[PDB]
Design an enzyme around this catalytic site. Sequence first.
Site, mmCIF file in Angstrom:
data_model
loop_
_atom_site.group_PDB
_atom_site.id
_atom_site.type_symbol
_atom_site.label_atom_id
_atom_site.label_comp_id
_atom_site.label_asym_id
_atom_site.label_seq_id
_atom_site.Cartn_x
_atom_site.Cartn_y
_atom_site.Cartn_z
ATOM 1 N N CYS A 17 6.431 -2.970 -54.658
ATOM 2 C CA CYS A 17 6.650 -2.734 -56.078
ATOM 3 C C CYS A 17 7.803 -3.537 -56.666
ATOM 4 O O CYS A 17 8.016 -3.477 -57.881
ATOM 5 C CB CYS A 17 6.896 -1.240 -56.337
ATOM 6 S SG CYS A 17 8.583 -0.698 -56.026
ATOM 7 N N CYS A 28 20.149 0.410 -39.868
ATOM 8 C CA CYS A 28 18.978 1.202 -40.227
ATOM 9 C C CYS A 28 17.899 0.266 -40.763
ATOM 10 O O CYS A 28 18.049 -0.314 -41.844
ATOM 11 C CB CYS A 28 19.344 2.259 -41.263
ATOM 12 S SG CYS A 28 17.990 3.380 -41.660
ATOM 13 N N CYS A 33 10.568 3.206 -49.934
ATOM 14 C CA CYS A 33 10.764 3.004 -51.367
ATOM 15 C C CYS A 33 10.474 4.292 -52.133
ATOM 16 O O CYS A 33 9.380 4.858 -52.027
ATOM 17 C CB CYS A 33 9.874 1.877 -51.881
ATOM 18 S SG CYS A 33 10.013 1.548 -53.663
HETATM 19 C C1 LIG Z 1 17.872 2.900 -43.200
HETATM 20 C C2 LIG Z 1 17.750 4.330 -43.779
HETATM 21 N N1 LIG Z 1 17.144 4.437 -45.116
HETATM 22 C C3 LIG Z 1 17.766 4.058 -46.235
HETATM 23 O O1 LIG Z 1 18.899 3.581 -46.202
HETATM 24 C C4 LIG Z 1 17.065 4.247 -47.567
HETATM 25 C C5 LIG Z 1 17.839 4.370 -48.694
HETATM 26 C C6 LIG Z 1 17.251 4.567 -49.962
HETATM 27 C C7 LIG Z 1 15.884 4.637 -50.024
HETATM 28 N N2 LIG Z 1 15.088 4.525 -48.919
HETATM 29 C C8 LIG Z 1 15.612 4.334 -47.647
HETATM 30 O O2 LIG Z 1 14.849 4.240 -46.676
HETATM 31 C C9 LIG Z 1 15.372 4.845 -51.414
HETATM 32 C C10 LIG Z 1 16.671 4.895 -52.236
HETATM 33 C C11 LIG Z 1 17.882 4.718 -51.313
HETATM 34 C C12 LIG Z 1 17.109 1.830 -43.967
HETATM 35 C C13 LIG Z 1 17.984 0.836 -44.682
HETATM 36 O O3 LIG Z 1 17.666 -0.358 -44.818
HETATM 37 O O4 LIG Z 1 19.165 1.295 -45.189
HETATM 38 C C14 LIG Z 1 19.542 0.773 -46.487
HETATM 39 ZN ZN LIG Z 2 8.296 0.052 -53.827
#
Ligand SMILES: *[C@H](CNC(=O)c1cc2c([nH]c1=O)CCC2)CC(=O)OC
Ligand SMILES: [Zn+2]
Length: 199
Positions: A17, A28, A33
Amino acid sequence: QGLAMYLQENGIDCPKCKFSYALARGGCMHFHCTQCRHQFCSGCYNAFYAKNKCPEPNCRVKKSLHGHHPRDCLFYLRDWTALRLQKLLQDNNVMFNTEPPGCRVIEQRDEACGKETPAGYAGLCQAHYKEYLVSLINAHSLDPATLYEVEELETATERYLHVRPQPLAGEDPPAYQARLLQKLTEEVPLGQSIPRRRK
Ligand SMILES: *[C@H](CNC(=O)c1cc2c([nH]c1=O)CCC2)CC(=O)OC
Ligand SMILES: [Zn+2]
Ligand code: NA
Ligand SMILES: [Zn+2]
Ligand SMILES: [Zn+2]
Ligand SMILES: [Zn+2]
């Protein structure tokens, strides 16, 4: 914040998107999304496919939630030592900070990282400093295979070429290593959807 804002300024853009999040990845790799509920790797932007939904032609874990990563994805390079990541950059004459130009990278309640920031890590924690180094590696499209040992080249050959290599009779380790490296380099490209920043 210095390098904390460098990590935060170029965040995460959903491949489906195109919504833009101003977030660091740290270690992580699983990103979900909010807007479209797409699940993808924040390092290479490949999607995590559910059971019996993987188009990968030779996938062996088709019936479970999983993803596939290129060899230069942060998913793998996050497990390298900072020294090995720095060696890859130095061999390619790419400047990297060891000093600033708790960790202040902002994560989600929206709160700061705050982990130990050891010396030589440019005022960041171990995980965010490695993310910083890997972003330089990706920006310059450097190939981590050039620092692989034979055992990592064997694993890579299996993972990406689906053949289990074996040393040839009377083949010294240097030649075996260089044969595997030459083969992997020629056939398997680096991440095609990795978000590569400017150099
Ligand atoms: C590791 C854990 N997940 C996230 O950090 C994460 C944050 C947000 C959202 N989705 C996610 O999976 C939507 C809004 C904030 C993944 C990562 O790359 O950390 C940034
Ligand atoms: Zn998206
Ligand atoms: Na792949
Ligand atoms: Zn990945
Ligand atoms: Zn698969
Ligand atoms: Zn941190």
